[PDB]
């Protein structure tokens, strides 16, 4: 048995690497975890032997039954291939878990890179991150932990739709959660600061969503699972005189 986790991307059918697609064709069994059903049908016509994991209660126990099911196949000695949405190693626990436990059982397990929502964002917004630089955080993690963003460079917040996802103790709406985030970002960015709600197109007949709005209107915004918030810089660059001095450049 063996495990190989591949990514389909955001677009349908067309946004998967030639190789990753080959893995699905030659897989003895495939474990799908895609959003829409158009993607689900496609996969099937790509390989008849497909086990949908959506069939599988806390997320702790859901992924435990998922991983367990994937392994069973690998333990039986079937060349297993796990097809996930976008990139199989980006905001994806099932893969890292499965690979980890397969490595722990001596089985061969790896992961092929695919196109993440971020890779799409750069193209759709004609942004080159290489020159500009960027930062990425899971919205929730950015709330529950101490993350100090650099407001001179782009800031992406993934899974902004489920930001503040936690166990129930008090009654808060999503807008209440988003309002807290807005307050927390206010430590660096003003309320009138323009942000962008990006949503990668799934279907080739659909265009990506690129809504701009002040940070203050985020709570009211209607968000989606795959929604990501882009927070462009709000502070100007400054010379790093310290390091410039060392390099040989000072007042010049």
Partner 1 sequence: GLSDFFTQLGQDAQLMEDYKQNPEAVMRAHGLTDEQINAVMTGDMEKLKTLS
CB nearer to its own copies: pick between 76 and 103? 103
Any binding-site annotation on 187?
no
Q: 42: Cβ–Cβ under 8 A, 6 or more apart, which residues?
A: 12, 13
Alpha carbons 243 and 230: distance in angstroms, whole number: 30
Find the helix or strand (DSSP H, E) in which 198 lies.
strand 194-199
Any binding-site annotation on 227?
yes
> Does 63 participate in catalysis according to the annotation?
yes
- Residue 168 found at the interface with its own copies (CB under 8 A): yes
The interface with Zn ion within residues 109-138 (CB under 5 A) comprises: 136
Phi, psi of 17 (to 5 degrees): -70, 150
> Does 212 participate in catalysis according to the annotation?
no
Catalytic residue among 21, 63, 75, 101: 63
The interface with its own copies within residues 220-239 (CB under 8 A) comprises: 237-239
> Smallest Cα–Cα separation from 44: which of 55, 29, 56?
29
CB nearer to its own copies: pick between 44 and 141? 141
CB nearer to partner 1: pick between 15 and 140? 15
Contact partner, 42, from its own copies, Zn ion, partner 1, none, Cβ < 5-8 Å per class? partner 1
Cα dist. 161→13, 57, 94, 178, 193 in Å? 25, 20, 20, 9, 20
Which phi-psi region, left, alpha or beta, contains residue 236 (left: φ > 0; alpha: ψ -120 to 50)? beta
Residue 86, helix vs strand vs coil: strand
Letter string b/e over residues 63-77, b meaning 16 or more CB atoms within 10 A of that residue's CB = beebbeebbebbeee
Catalytic residue among 21, 23, 85, 212: 85
> Does 198 participate in catalysis according to the annotation?
no
Q: Is residue 190 within 8 Å of 215, Cβ to Cβ?
A: yes
> Smallest Cα–Cα separation from 142: which of 120, 158, 166, 125?
158
Any binding-site annotation on 134?
yes
Contact partner, 145, from its own copies, partner 1, Zn ion, none, Cβ < 5-8 Å per class? its own copies
- Residue 169 found at the interface with its own copies (CB under 8 A): yes
- Residue 130 found at the interface with partner 1 (CB under 8 A): no
Sheet with 29-33, edge to edge strand ranges = 50-52, 29-33, 79-84, 2-7, 108-111
In this chain, which stretch among 36-44, 91-99, 189-197, 212-220 interacts with its own copies, using CB under 8 A? 91-99
What x/- string results for residues 58 through 97 when contact with partner 1 is judged by CB under 8 A?
---------------------x------------------
Given 19, 93, 210, 249, the residue binding partner 1 (CB under 8 A): 19
- Name the residues annotated as catalytic: 59, 63, 85
Instruction: List residues forming the annotated binding site for S-adenosyl-L-homocysteine.
Output: 87, 117, 159, 200, 225, 227-228
Q: Which residues bind partner 1 (CB under 8 A)?
A: 2, 4, 11-15, 18-19, 22-23, 25-27, 37-38, 41-42, 45, 79, 108, 203-207
């Amino acid at each position: 048995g063996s495990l190989v986790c591949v990514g389909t991307g955001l677009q349908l059918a067309g946004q998967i690497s030639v190789l990753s697609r080959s893995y699905i064709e030659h897989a003895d069994i495939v474990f799908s975890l895609l959003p829409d059903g158009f993607s689900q049908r496609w996969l099937t016509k790509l390989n008849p032997n497909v086990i949908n994991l959506q069939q599988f209660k806390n997320r702790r126990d859901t992924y435990e039954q998922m991983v367990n099911a994937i392994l069973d196949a690998v333990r039986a000695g079937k060349k297993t291939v796990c097809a996930l949405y976008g990139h199989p190693g980006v905001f994806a626990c099932v893969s890292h878990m499965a690979i980890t436990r397969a490595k722990a059982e001596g089985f061969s397990a790896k992961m092929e890179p695919g196109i993440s929502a971020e890779a799409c964002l750069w193209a759709d917004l004609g942004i080159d991150p290489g020159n500009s630089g960027h930062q990425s955080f899971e919205a929730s993690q950015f709330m529950f932990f101490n993350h100090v963003p650099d407001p001179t460079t782009h800031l992406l917040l993934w899974q902004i739709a489920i930001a503040g996802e936690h166990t129930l103790t008090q009654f808060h709406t999503s807008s209440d959660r988003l309002q807290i985030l807005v307050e927390q970002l206010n430590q660096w960015y003003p309320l009138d600061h323009e942000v962008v709600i990006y949503e990668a197109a799934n279907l080739p007949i659909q265009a990506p969503r690129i809504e701009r709005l002040p940070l203050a209107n985020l709570p009211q915004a209607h968000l989606m699972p795959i929604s990501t918030l882009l927070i462009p810089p709000a502070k100007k660059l400054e010379y790093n005189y310290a390091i410039l001095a060392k390099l040989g450049i000072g007042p010049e």
